[PDB]
Amino acid sequence: TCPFYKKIPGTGFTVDAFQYGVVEGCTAYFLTHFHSDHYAGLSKHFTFPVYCSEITGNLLKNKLHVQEQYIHPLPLDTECIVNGVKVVLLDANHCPGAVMILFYLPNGTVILHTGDFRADPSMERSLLADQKVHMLYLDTTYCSPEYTFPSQQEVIRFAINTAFEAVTLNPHALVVCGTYSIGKEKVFLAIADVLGSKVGMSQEKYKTLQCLNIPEINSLITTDMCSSLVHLLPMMQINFKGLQSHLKKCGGKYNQILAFRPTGWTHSNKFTRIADVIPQTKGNISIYGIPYSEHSSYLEMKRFVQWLKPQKIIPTVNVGTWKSRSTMEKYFREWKLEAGY
Ligand code: NI
């Protein structure tokens, strides 16, 4: 049964609610982004209207085979009417095609559902600036002050400088980057660009990337592994055994691997700066865990909420334990008392 925090009161709508069967009273199913915990349940046999971004709709059609007649893509930053209710999709600064949804209820209530997001001050100048928001359905993934991480720009600077140094010292080094979902494409695209290479990958991953409207993509990626010195592999193969095995497959073209695992947060964040990050090494294989996040840090989340000043907050992440829920509610009250709303 669908939980309350996935339902939008006063409408026929649900958000990211495809694993509960036919939801009673639901006339339209919204999907914020193409990540499996959110799409879980969709397939070619789904016959209700799905509302989403253009990019999410490309992925539904091509990867899950949802039929076209049930996919309703909406443009961003544009007022649209869905089953008698005004809605707007906004960029969530998460993975490609990820959106936040603004619902303008018939009684005058305005609700923002963030989906998954990485808050940014640029959001303070979107269509959010123009009216009051009463209820916030908030991505609380990292809602505790211990969660600090660097900007995406500092992390990509580190990665580019690390890869360029290694390959210039040893032109026979291969760079490998792990992946298991869409998102974080900048990591592997920025490294391939500094090296003058395409990124090589499986046919299945190439297909997925071709759905993303990324500019000039045919110029940056390939299925010809032999021509590429940056390879993408499944995240589960980014370990010493998996990488040794890959290096064997390359036929003596390479004699060293430098590999990257983009994690979100790891407790090495509470002590060490990005500048100071070191790899795990075994023989001719080094693995770097880099803190590339597509979710808000604690401070970014706090700034957004203190700017928006909602009347009520509904967390959508970390809701399964009483300790988590109590921690989050304490921070929400602090924020409100400090800012004065
Ligand atoms: Ni996500």
From Swiss-Prot:
Locations listed in the record: Nucleus
Induction statement: During mitosis. The mRNA encoding this protein contains an internal ribosome entry site (IRES) in its 5'-UTR. This 5'-UTR generally suppresses translation while specifically promoting expression during mitosis, when cap-dependent translation may be impaired.
Coiled coil, from the record: none
Membrane-spanning segments: none
Description of how the protein assembles with itself and partners: Binds constitutively to TP53BP1. Binds CDC27, which is itself a component of the anaphase promoting complex (APC). Binds PIAS1.
Family statement: Belongs to the DNA repair metallo-beta-lactamase (DRMBL) family.
Protein name, per record: DNA cross-link repair 1A protein
Lineage: Eukaryota, Metazoa, Chordata, Craniata, Vertebrata
Span covered, complete protein: 700 to 1040 of 1040
